[PDB]
Amino acid sequence: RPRQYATVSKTHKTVSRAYGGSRCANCVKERIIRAFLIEEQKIVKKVVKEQTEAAK
Amino acid sequence: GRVIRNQRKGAGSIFTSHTRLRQGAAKLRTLDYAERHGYIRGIVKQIVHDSGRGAPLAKVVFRDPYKYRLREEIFIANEGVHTGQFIYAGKKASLNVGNVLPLGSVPEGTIVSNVEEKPGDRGALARASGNYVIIIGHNPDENKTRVRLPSGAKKVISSDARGVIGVIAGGGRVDKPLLKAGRAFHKYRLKRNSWPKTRGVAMNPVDHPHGGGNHQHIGKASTISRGAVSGQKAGLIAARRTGLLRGSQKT
Amino acid sequence: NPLTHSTPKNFGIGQAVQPKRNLSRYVKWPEYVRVQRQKKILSIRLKVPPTIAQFQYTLDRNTAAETFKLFNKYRPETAAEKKERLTKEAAAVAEGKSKQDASPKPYAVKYGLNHVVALIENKKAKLVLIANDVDPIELVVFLPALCKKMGVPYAIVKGKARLGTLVNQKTSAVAALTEVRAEDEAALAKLVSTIDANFADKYDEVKKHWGGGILGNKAQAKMDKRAKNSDSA
RNA sequence: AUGGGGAAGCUCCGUUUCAAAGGCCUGAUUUUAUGCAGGCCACCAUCGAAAGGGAAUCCGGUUAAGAUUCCGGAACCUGGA
RNA sequence: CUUAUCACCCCGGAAUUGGUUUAUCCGGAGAUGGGGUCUUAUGGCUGGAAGAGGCCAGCACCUUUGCUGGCUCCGGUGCGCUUGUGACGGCCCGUGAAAAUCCACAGGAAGGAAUAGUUUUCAUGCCAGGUCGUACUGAUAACCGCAGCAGGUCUCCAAGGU
RNA sequence: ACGAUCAACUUA
RNA sequence: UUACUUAUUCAAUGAAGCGGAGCUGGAAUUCAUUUUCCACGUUCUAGCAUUCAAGGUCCCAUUCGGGGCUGAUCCGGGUUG
């Protein structure tokens, strides 16, 4: 119960991974992959826009 | 000789709506800057059943453009809208199902829903399940849009009024027979206290203009004038015609 | 230098949180502030009768400065000076039994609305200054007409607070010179001549000329744009 | 209740609305001081359940009558230091 | 301290389809198989704790009356009853409150170093926990019905045989 | 091509 | 019926982007170059976006940091319809 969570130490309320006690391993992995891949997509889209603007 | 059912309904003590299990007012987001000068991308995150309403509602999330925080909005879900989906709201949004383009932005013949009567009232037309509004035409000068309303009606409204593109989900509901006083009881016990209805001819003359008599008959004509007063307006109010129809909707 | 980098965030429509700009234009002001601004707007938007636009016709800065320098020269007595004059007069009338004439004849600016109106009626005031900021306009509307009828020079000045600090008050709404020393009579004469040329010689024309009727910024812009569209060939 | 608007008035509507609606932290460390070289917001009264939600106690013994309340033992929670 | 369904992870990569529930549902979006991780329901072993409580036998003896000794140990069964829990299926034009409160996570503000600083979310240690209710009946006699009225009045536990 | 202990509860 | 908005009425918003002019380009290709229009950094993915913002520039009585302008155009205070 929530007050038992209050009286319980931090180790039992979380996991050592990022987003430990809030999100699961699969969700964390999926959002890490999404972040990296979308950033790469944005970078390549930016350079494509730059090169087509330079051409035109 | 006594106040009648509709007269009591107006006072509305036991006739209010049962609103405990409803998921909030289903309105579009406000028209501040982004919806009229561009587009804002939101994620429809969840699709739920609104109690008392035949259509599903959509919990959607946008980013606040002025302060770091998330804004949750209660849309009326259009058919085909799925969870975790990018919807787009604004003047410059693309014509896709679930987007909130204005009428001036959508082209002729488009199918929209939850459309605004005036720009900024957050949706007033075609909100019931399976309904939609068609764009009949545009008048760019004195910017206006003629649209067709599910009653088969023509309304001319400002082009800046918005509306989510598509058709309300949950269509065909009334196609299923209720089949049971129990099903009707549950439906109206979540809607409001308006069921079952006793017939005026079955009531006493004190209780209704139709009451009384050694036979259950109305007695006088059941078509009531528009200028009639409260307690008299029982039956057919200002009926232009009457009886079984033979033809079409003339539209 | 090699450690820092160029971040710049994009402030597009749906790009990033908008910066903290100046929202002074869109402040939800208090009700009394709104009444203030909207009352001014209504006053300048309605067609004011000529009593307004003969008011709001304050005399220019240089003439106002000269008038108020002369009036500060003719400033009335204060509390301490009055007490000193009182004890001097008491001592004089107690030792020499003087007929209260030991103190010299005063030369002050006569203020107060009733007093100044009576002076105008009696033809005793040589110059009148009427504040343009009198909150109930009923009290000063008739004053230019009365001054014109009695042939006494008048000028509409800016600041009842200035008139009050002139007469050692908070608000005076009127000031009057009824007598002038011989040391600055020529300066007074030139100044009243310029005040006359500004106000009395133009009283009739200004009373004829109406004021007000000015529309707002957006309304004027729309008027100009509509006229240009109409006459565009 | 309040702001505010009705009503001759007892009082009515209204509960966030057309209101100028506001309280806690390492804190400057000594005559000062939630006045201060500082910081953020946005529920925007309150009442309403001894069957809803909810911090924490069990056993044994004991009285004419009280006990998960007393006694003996063994625990737990909250607040503070 | 140790124990499960469900769920999750690693390894190979499966039609000759396999696994599998009472209920036919999953598996290249990675099943069978092998190994492992997690939840405190629940159960087990200890501590509490046998010193308690019960079941017995014996000895003092108007003396608000006592004291000793022994035992309290191993199992088994089930469409059993009740209760709780779990994985599930059916139903809805019905999809079955809120809030207080308590945690956690993103982010990195500020602060911190050889006898001096960073942890009172690890262990142990100190103090306090105010106010009102608490008896009894709860019904063919303690409530209401003029009453010790064949009436009415909400709920918990529920042995054996047929 | 291979077999002992171990509930007893429902049908014929 | 006409070119109205300030009375009054209606609806929202934490009264945030109103009106007008300018930075940049694409046009009929300009009978001389703002003369007419437009755009004013975001659409394959249930990721993220917050410390008067990093950079730039000038000034630093130079401690464990800053100040102005910029980034983020200017004018009009009519919050918008």
Short mmCIF file of C-alpha atoms in Angstrom, two decimals, chain B:
data_model
loop_
_atom_site.label_atom_id
_atom_site.label_comp_id
_atom_site.label_asym_id
_atom_site.label_seq_id
_atom_site.Cartn_x
_atom_site.Cartn_y
_atom_site.Cartn_z
CA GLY B 1 -55.75 20.39 -12.61
CA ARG B 2 -52.16 19.57 -11.66
CA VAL B 3 -48.70 20.20 -13.07
CA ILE B 4 -47.72 17.70 -15.76
CA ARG B 5 -44.65 15.59 -16.48
CA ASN B 6 -42.82 17.97 -18.84
CA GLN B 7 -43.55 20.89 -16.52
CA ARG B 8 -41.84 18.93 -13.75
CA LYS B 9 -38.97 17.92 -16.06
CA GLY B 10 -38.22 21.59 -16.58
CA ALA B 11 -37.80 22.13 -12.85
CA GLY B 12 -35.53 19.10 -13.07
CA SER B 13 -34.86 17.71 -9.60
CA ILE B 14 -35.02 13.99 -10.38
CA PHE B 15 -34.81 14.78 -14.11
CA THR B 16 -31.17 15.87 -14.18
CA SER B 17 -28.58 13.84 -16.07
CA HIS B 18 -26.64 11.01 -14.41
CA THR B 19 -23.11 12.31 -14.94
CA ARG B 20 -20.99 10.32 -12.47
CA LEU B 21 -19.50 7.89 -15.00
CA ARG B 22 -18.99 10.37 -17.85
CA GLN B 23 -15.41 11.04 -18.92
CA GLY B 24 -15.71 14.82 -19.16
CA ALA B 25 -17.08 17.24 -21.73
CA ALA B 26 -16.06 16.22 -25.25
CA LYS B 27 -14.68 19.44 -26.73
CA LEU B 28 -11.95 20.41 -29.15
CA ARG B 29 -8.91 22.27 -27.91
CA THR B 30 -8.96 26.05 -27.72
CA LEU B 31 -8.14 28.27 -30.71
CA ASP B 32 -5.29 30.36 -29.36
CA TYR B 33 -2.43 30.67 -31.88
CA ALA B 34 -1.29 27.34 -33.30
CA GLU B 35 -4.66 26.11 -34.56
CA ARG B 36 -5.20 29.30 -36.58
CA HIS B 37 -1.61 29.95 -37.71
CA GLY B 38 -0.29 26.42 -38.28
CA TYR B 39 -0.77 22.98 -36.76
CA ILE B 40 -0.06 21.24 -33.46
CA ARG B 41 0.64 17.51 -33.27
CA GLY B 42 -1.06 15.52 -30.55
CA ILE B 43 -1.02 11.84 -29.62
CA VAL B 44 -4.35 10.15 -29.16
CA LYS B 45 -3.27 7.88 -26.31
CA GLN B 46 -6.47 6.16 -25.24
CA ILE B 47 -9.93 5.32 -26.56
CA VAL B 48 -12.66 4.73 -23.98
CA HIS B 49 -16.40 4.30 -23.63
CA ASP B 50 -18.25 7.39 -22.42
CA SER B 51 -21.22 6.28 -20.35
CA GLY B 52 -24.52 7.65 -21.62
CA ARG B 53 -23.02 8.45 -25.04
CA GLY B 54 -23.09 6.08 -28.00
CA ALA B 55 -19.71 7.17 -29.32
CA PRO B 56 -16.27 6.43 -27.89
CA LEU B 57 -14.14 9.27 -26.56
CA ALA B 58 -10.44 9.83 -27.17
CA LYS B 59 -7.97 10.94 -24.52
CA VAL B 60 -5.44 12.92 -26.59
CA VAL B 61 -2.31 14.71 -25.37
CA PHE B 62 -0.71 17.86 -26.78
CA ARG B 63 2.32 19.89 -25.72
CA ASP B 64 1.65 23.29 -24.20
CA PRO B 65 3.39 25.77 -26.55
CA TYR B 66 3.98 28.32 -23.76
CA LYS B 67 4.91 26.28 -20.66
CA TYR B 68 6.63 22.92 -20.23
CA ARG B 69 3.69 20.59 -19.51
CA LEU B 70 1.23 18.28 -21.26
CA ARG B 71 -2.40 19.18 -22.02
CA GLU B 72 -5.00 16.41 -22.16
CA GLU B 73 -8.10 16.83 -24.32
CA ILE B 74 -11.32 14.85 -24.63
CA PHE B 75 -12.17 14.39 -28.29
CA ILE B 76 -15.03 12.46 -29.84
CA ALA B 77 -13.36 9.51 -31.52
CA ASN B 78 -13.81 9.21 -35.27
CA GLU B 79 -13.94 5.80 -36.90
CA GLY B 80 -10.50 4.36 -37.55
CA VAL B 81 -8.72 6.44 -34.90
CA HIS B 82 -6.43 4.13 -32.93
CA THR B 83 -4.43 4.53 -29.74
CA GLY B 84 -1.00 6.11 -29.83
CA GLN B 85 -1.69 7.93 -33.07
CA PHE B 86 -0.56 11.32 -34.36
CA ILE B 87 -3.53 13.61 -34.88
CA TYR B 88 -2.96 17.16 -36.10
CA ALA B 89 -5.01 20.22 -35.18
CA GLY B 90 -4.75 23.52 -37.00
CA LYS B 91 -5.24 25.53 -40.15
CA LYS B 92 -2.24 23.98 -41.92
CA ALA B 93 -2.95 20.37 -40.93
CA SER B 94 -3.31 17.66 -43.56
CA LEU B 95 -6.66 16.22 -44.65
CA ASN B 96 -6.58 12.97 -42.69
CA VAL B 97 -9.12 11.19 -40.51
CA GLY B 98 -8.89 12.57 -36.98
CA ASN B 99 -7.31 15.91 -37.88
CA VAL B 100 -8.95 19.15 -36.79
CA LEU B 101 -8.69 21.28 -39.94
CA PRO B 102 -11.04 24.28 -40.20
CA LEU B 103 -13.88 24.34 -42.69
CA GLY B 104 -12.07 26.96 -44.76
CA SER B 105 -9.11 24.58 -44.93
CA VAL B 106 -11.06 21.43 -45.88
CA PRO B 107 -12.15 21.23 -49.55
CA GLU B 108 -15.59 20.85 -51.11
CA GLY B 109 -17.35 17.57 -50.39
CA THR B 110 -15.29 16.75 -47.30
CA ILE B 111 -16.78 14.69 -44.47
CA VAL B 112 -16.23 16.35 -41.10
CA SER B 113 -17.64 15.83 -37.62
CA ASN B 114 -17.85 17.59 -34.25
CA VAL B 115 -17.81 20.84 -36.23
CA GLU B 116 -17.93 24.25 -34.56
CA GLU B 117 -21.03 26.39 -35.01
CA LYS B 118 -18.89 29.50 -34.48
CA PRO B 119 -15.08 29.67 -34.42
CA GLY B 120 -13.94 28.79 -30.91
CA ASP B 121 -16.95 27.04 -29.35
CA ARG B 122 -15.11 23.67 -29.42
CA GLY B 123 -17.54 21.54 -31.40
CA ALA B 124 -21.33 21.63 -31.65
CA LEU B 125 -22.51 19.77 -34.79
CA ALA B 126 -22.57 16.08 -35.72
CA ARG B 127 -21.32 14.63 -32.44
CA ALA B 128 -23.64 11.63 -32.03
CA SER B 129 -22.36 8.22 -33.06
CA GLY B 130 -22.27 7.58 -36.80
CA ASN B 131 -23.06 11.17 -37.81
CA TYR B 132 -21.15 13.67 -39.91
CA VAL B 133 -21.37 17.02 -41.70
CA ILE B 134 -20.76 17.43 -45.44
CA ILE B 135 -19.20 20.53 -46.99
CA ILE B 136 -21.53 21.71 -49.74
CA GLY B 137 -19.66 24.84 -50.75
CA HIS B 138 -17.46 27.82 -49.96
CA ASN B 139 -17.95 31.59 -50.24
CA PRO B 140 -14.45 33.07 -49.90
CA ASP B 141 -15.78 36.63 -49.91
CA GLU B 142 -17.29 37.25 -46.49
CA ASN B 143 -15.60 33.96 -45.69
CA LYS B 144 -18.32 31.37 -45.17
CA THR B 145 -19.03 27.69 -45.73
CA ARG B 146 -22.33 26.07 -46.62
CA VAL B 147 -22.61 22.64 -45.00
CA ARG B 148 -25.17 19.85 -44.73
CA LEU B 149 -26.19 18.75 -41.18
CA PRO B 150 -27.33 15.20 -40.34
CA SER B 151 -30.92 16.37 -40.17
CA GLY B 152 -30.49 16.97 -43.87
CA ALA B 153 -30.20 20.69 -43.17
CA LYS B 154 -28.30 23.53 -44.83
CA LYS B 155 -26.30 25.82 -42.56
CA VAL B 156 -23.95 28.63 -43.57
CA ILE B 157 -21.23 29.11 -40.95
CA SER B 158 -17.93 30.94 -40.60
CA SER B 159 -15.01 29.34 -42.43
CA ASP B 160 -12.80 29.60 -39.33
CA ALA B 161 -14.97 27.07 -37.46
CA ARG B 162 -13.13 23.79 -36.95
CA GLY B 163 -14.16 20.15 -37.06
CA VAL B 164 -12.49 16.75 -36.85
CA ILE B 165 -12.36 15.05 -40.25
CA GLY B 166 -14.19 11.73 -40.53
CA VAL B 167 -17.35 10.21 -39.08
CA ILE B 168 -18.21 9.61 -35.43
CA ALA B 169 -17.40 6.08 -34.29
CA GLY B 170 -19.98 3.65 -32.97
CA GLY B 171 -22.26 3.86 -35.99
CA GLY B 172 -25.14 1.50 -36.58
CA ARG B 173 -26.05 1.33 -32.88
CA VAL B 174 -29.76 2.03 -33.38
CA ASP B 175 -29.71 -0.77 -35.97
CA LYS B 176 -29.96 -3.28 -33.13
CA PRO B 177 -33.38 -3.81 -31.52
CA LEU B 178 -33.30 -3.15 -27.80
CA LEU B 179 -35.41 -6.31 -27.44
CA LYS B 180 -36.00 -5.75 -23.73
CA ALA B 181 -37.44 -3.32 -21.24
CA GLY B 182 -34.31 -4.26 -19.31
CA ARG B 183 -32.01 -2.99 -22.05
CA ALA B 184 -34.06 0.21 -22.29
CA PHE B 185 -33.94 0.50 -18.49
CA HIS B 186 -30.15 0.28 -18.40
CA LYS B 187 -29.74 2.69 -21.32
CA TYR B 188 -31.95 5.34 -19.75
CA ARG B 189 -30.71 4.69 -16.21
CA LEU B 190 -27.34 5.81 -17.45
CA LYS B 191 -28.76 8.62 -19.62
CA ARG B 192 -31.42 10.35 -17.47
CA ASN B 193 -34.79 9.80 -15.79
CA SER B 194 -37.05 9.75 -18.84
CA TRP B 195 -38.25 6.12 -18.94
CA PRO B 196 -40.73 4.43 -18.73
CA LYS B 197 -43.37 6.85 -20.08
CA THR B 198 -47.03 6.56 -19.13
CA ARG B 199 -49.52 7.59 -21.80
CA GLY B 200 -51.59 10.71 -21.24
CA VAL B 201 -54.75 8.90 -22.32
CA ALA B 202 -53.96 6.37 -19.58
CA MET B 203 -53.54 9.12 -16.98
CA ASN B 204 -56.39 11.04 -15.30
CA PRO B 205 -57.71 14.40 -16.55
CA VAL B 206 -56.03 16.11 -13.59
CA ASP B 207 -52.69 14.68 -14.76
CA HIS B 208 -52.90 15.42 -18.49
CA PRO B 209 -54.93 17.10 -21.25
CA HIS B 210 -55.34 13.59 -22.72
CA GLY B 211 -56.59 12.02 -19.49
CA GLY B 212 -60.09 10.98 -18.54
CA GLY B 213 -63.07 9.52 -20.33
CA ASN B 214 -64.84 6.18 -20.25
CA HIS B 215 -62.66 5.20 -23.23
CA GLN B 216 -58.96 5.93 -23.62
CA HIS B 217 -59.16 8.69 -26.23
CA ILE B 218 -57.53 12.09 -26.59
CA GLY B 219 -60.82 13.91 -27.18
CA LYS B 220 -59.47 17.02 -28.88
CA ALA B 221 -57.01 17.36 -31.74
CA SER B 222 -53.50 16.29 -30.73
CA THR B 223 -51.80 19.02 -32.80
CA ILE B 224 -50.94 21.92 -30.49
CA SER B 225 -50.24 25.51 -31.49
CA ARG B 226 -46.78 27.02 -31.15
CA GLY B 227 -48.39 29.84 -29.16
CA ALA B 228 -49.85 27.44 -26.62
CA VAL B 229 -48.68 27.75 -23.04
CA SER B 230 -47.00 25.35 -20.62
CA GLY B 231 -49.35 22.57 -19.59
CA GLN B 232 -51.12 22.74 -22.96
CA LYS B 233 -48.19 21.68 -25.15
CA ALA B 234 -48.78 17.93 -24.98
CA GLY B 235 -48.99 15.84 -28.13
CA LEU B 236 -47.76 17.18 -31.47
CA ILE B 237 -46.41 20.72 -31.20
CA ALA B 238 -46.96 23.02 -34.20
CA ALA B 239 -47.28 20.01 -36.49
CA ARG B 240 -47.03 21.24 -40.07
CA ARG B 241 -48.45 17.94 -41.33
CA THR B 242 -49.43 14.62 -39.79
CA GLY B 243 -49.83 10.94 -40.61
CA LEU B 244 -47.82 8.30 -42.41
CA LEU B 245 -45.36 9.74 -44.92
CA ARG B 246 -45.07 8.64 -48.55
CA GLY B 247 -42.06 9.92 -50.47
CA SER B 248 -38.61 11.19 -49.50
CA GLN B 249 -36.91 13.91 -47.44
CA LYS B 250 -37.18 16.41 -50.35
CA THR B 251 -33.43 17.05 -50.17
#
